[PDB]
């Protein structure tokens, strides 16, 4: 068995703390239990692992979770609303090949929702299930039981796990509510990194990521906006706040709409980077092993396929995709004593309405 | 950081 504490801070999740416990097997019973749990700003999880790498003779393996998550949508800068949830997964794992696993799986979730701002696309998913709470008030709730089906599917011929220098990897996930559940909708999330090496040393790499997400309603209802994809920060467009991206709450009146720069995502999501790796200058040959320079190209796009811009025409089209914001910046990593390490600088050169910038960015990571 | 030890 093992045990494990971190430490970490981020621009957007600040000071962040995480642990865990496994007993690599449980009385022979063959399946590793687990204890881990994490907090940062905005989030505070737990969950009990249970797995078997060898549920068959050849490899398939038998994953089981259960899992509390409290979140704060404020402290994600996002429009307010907390959503306190806690469900279980049931996984098995398929290794196709050298390169590529596949799993499937099924899993219940419980969400819990309060605290909610009255705005309109939030309000709009309300009114799609059938809930018509007051849109004067922030003492509301909303509760949900689903059960869902999770694929996944993940590509991996990385040449190295720390600092790549050539392949790719890829991961699909998606996941579809079975009938019977309360909300009704199927969501879709793609992640690509590329590393070209354009020199024989592998020093001077050529990076190219893509992130993708879409998720829709069926049966009328809308997909959970809890559920919604977010761009901008630290991992996704360097140089924008994090998750500023995208649609803005258009928020009712208090006790007649108002505008506002509070972003609240959206159920379709693309971004895009290309970034170029090169040694880093001022520094010594010595630690070269240890640090990463790029220059990189960040682009990406949020929106709600259901605005509805005939009823709200006073304000911006919200289902409008080509709103694409980019952003032009540095970046510098470093395996430090305090762990793995991320500072960037960026300029958000294409920015819009609402857009808040955060030009210097920092990572140091908690789970190396 | 992350610290780790085997139990
Ligand atoms: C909330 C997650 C629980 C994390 C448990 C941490 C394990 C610390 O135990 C140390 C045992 O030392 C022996
Ligand atoms: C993690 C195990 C999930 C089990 C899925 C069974 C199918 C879900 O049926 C839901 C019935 O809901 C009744 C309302
Ligand atoms: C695999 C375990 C699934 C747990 C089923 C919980 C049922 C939740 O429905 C609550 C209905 O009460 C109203
Ligand atoms: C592995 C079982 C998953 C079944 C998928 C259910 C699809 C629900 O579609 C609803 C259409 O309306
Ligand atoms: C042996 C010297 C390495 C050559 C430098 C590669 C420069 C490629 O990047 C320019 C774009
Ligand atoms: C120890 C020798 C350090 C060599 C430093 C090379 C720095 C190369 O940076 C080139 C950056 O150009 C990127 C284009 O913008």
Redesign the pocket.
């Known amino acids: 068995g093992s045990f494990n504490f971190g430490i970490g801070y981020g621009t957007e999740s600040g000071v962040s703390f995480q642990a865990g416990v496994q007993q690599d097997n449980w009385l022979g019973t063959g399946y590793a239990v687990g204890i881990n749990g994490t907090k940062n700003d905005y989030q505070t999880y737990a969950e009990l692992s249970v797995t078997n790498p060898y549920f068959t003779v050849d490899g398939v393996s038998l994953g089981g979770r259960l899992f509390y998550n409290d979140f704060q949508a404020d402290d994600a800068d996002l429009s307010d609303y907390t959503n306190k949830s806690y469900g279980t997964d049931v996984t098995l794992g398929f290794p196709i090949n050298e390169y590529n696993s596949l799993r499937a799986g099924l899993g219940y979730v419980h969400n819990s929702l309060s605290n909610m701002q009255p705005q309109v696309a939030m309000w709009r998913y309300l009114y799609s299930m059938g809930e018509h709470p007051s849109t004067s008030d922030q003492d509301n709730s909303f509760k949900t039981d689903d059960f869902t089906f999770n694929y996944g599917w993940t590509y991996n011929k990385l040449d190295r796990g720390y600092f790549p220098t050539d392949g790719s990897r890829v991961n699909l996930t998606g996941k579809v509510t079975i009938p019977g559940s309360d909300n009704e909708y199927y969501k879709v999330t793609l992640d690509t990194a590329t590393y070209v090496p354009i020199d024989d040393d592998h020093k001077w790499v050529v990076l190219g990521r893509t992130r993708w997400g879409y998720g829709d309603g069926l049966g009328g209802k809308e997909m959970p906006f809890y559920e919604n994809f977010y761009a901008g920060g630290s991992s996704t467009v360097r140089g924008f706040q994090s998750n500023t991206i995208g649609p803005k709450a258009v928020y009712f009146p208090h006790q007649d709409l108002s505008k506002s720069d509070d972003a609240v995502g959206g159920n379709a999501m693309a971004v895009a980077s290309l970034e ?1 790796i ?8 010595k630690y ?1 092993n240890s640090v990463r ?1 790029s ?1 990189f190209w960040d682009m990406g796009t949020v929106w709600d396929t259901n605005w509805d811009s005939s009823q709200y025409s006073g304000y911006p089209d919200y289902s409008d995709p080509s709103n694409i914001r980019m952003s032009a910046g ?1 970046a510098l990593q470093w395996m430090s004593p305090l762990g793995p390490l991320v500072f960037s600088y960026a300029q958000p050169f294409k920015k819009y309405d609402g857009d808040k910038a955060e030009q210097f960015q920092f990572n140091i990571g908690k789970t190396w | 950081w992350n610290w780790t030890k085997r139990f």
């Open positions: 170029f090169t040694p880093t200058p001022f520094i010594s040959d070269a320079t220059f540095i």
